[PDB]
Amino acid sequence: EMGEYKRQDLVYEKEDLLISGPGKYPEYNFYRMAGMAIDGKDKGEAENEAKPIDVKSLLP
């Protein structure tokens, strides 16, 4: 049910497409897989990522 009166009102902006929950995929989170550091997710906290080792570390 998306029929409209004016054709200009069929242009759905970002506030007309963003819903409250995950929809059909309830658990996938991309930024848990991505390697870039964001808020609440430091380098090495992503999935299958080791902690970053500095080049100045004493291990050989």
Partner: protein, 227 residues
């Protein structure tokens, strides 16, 4: 000089290496560490082709086409099964530690590693262990740094030191903890530091000015202009 690639005869410049000679004829060979303006170092081991000693040979030998001269009567093969398997294995080795960053990476659609991954036909992952990570430096207002996406092809250090003459970028570290950057934070003081965003085949050095208002390469409208 005369070369025979996959049973096809070609005429090339005799003072060129095999990689640039085969690239000038339209033949496709994957390569990372070689640049036409920087020379050859044989680092990435991606440009492997099977060279035969004479016209009638079956064994051959996997050689670096960026390090092999294109002398007269050189018989090589690009699409041999051993060469293609080795190139796919090199791509797979480069993909073991590579971050899952392509949607959020400024080089997506312009990435040499993406094209060389697709061209070698590598699309199935079997490496299941952890991936190494690195902290990112601050290189100034123009260059944005992401060391996670590096493949250690040494293009940046070679250009920035041998070509650009810069002094504040280098390779540090060890076996697989190589770090390409400044010894500390700060702006790259070279006057030709901006070419790193095109020299680097990956998303390590990115145009931060472009990365602010970012769009992809297929979404751009270009024109050939003069600076």
């Amino acid at each position: 000089a005369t070369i025979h690639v996959d049973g096809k005869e070609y005429e090339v410049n005799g003072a060129d290496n095999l990689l640039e000679a085969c690239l000038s004829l339209g033949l496709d060979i994957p390569y990372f560490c070689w640049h036409p303006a920087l020379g050859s170092v044989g680092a990435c081991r991606q440009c492997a082709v099977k060279q035969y000693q004479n016209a009638e040979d079956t064994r051959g030998r996997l050689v670096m086409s960026c390090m092999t001269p294109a002398s007269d009567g050189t018989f090589i093969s690009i699409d041999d099964e051993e060469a293609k398997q080795f190139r796919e294995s090199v791509v797979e080795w480069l993909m073991t530690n590579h971050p899952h960053d392509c949607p959020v990476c400024e080089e997506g659609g312009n990435c040499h590693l993406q094209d060389m991954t697709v061209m070698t036909g590598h699309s199935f992952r079997r490496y299941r262990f952890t991936k190494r990570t690195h902290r990112n430096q601050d290189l100034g207002p123009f260059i944005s740094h992401e060391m996670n996406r590096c493949i250690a092809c040494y293009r940046c250090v070679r250009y920035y030191k041998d070509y650009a003459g810069g002094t504040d970028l280098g390779v540090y570290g060890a076996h697989d903890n190589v770090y390409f950057g400044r010894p500390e934070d700060g702006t790259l003081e070279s006057e030709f530091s901006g070419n790193l965003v095109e020299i680097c085949p990956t998303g390590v050095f990115t145009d931060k000015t472009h990365s602010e208002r970012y769009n992809r390469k297929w979404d751009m409208q270009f024109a050939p202009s003069i600076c």
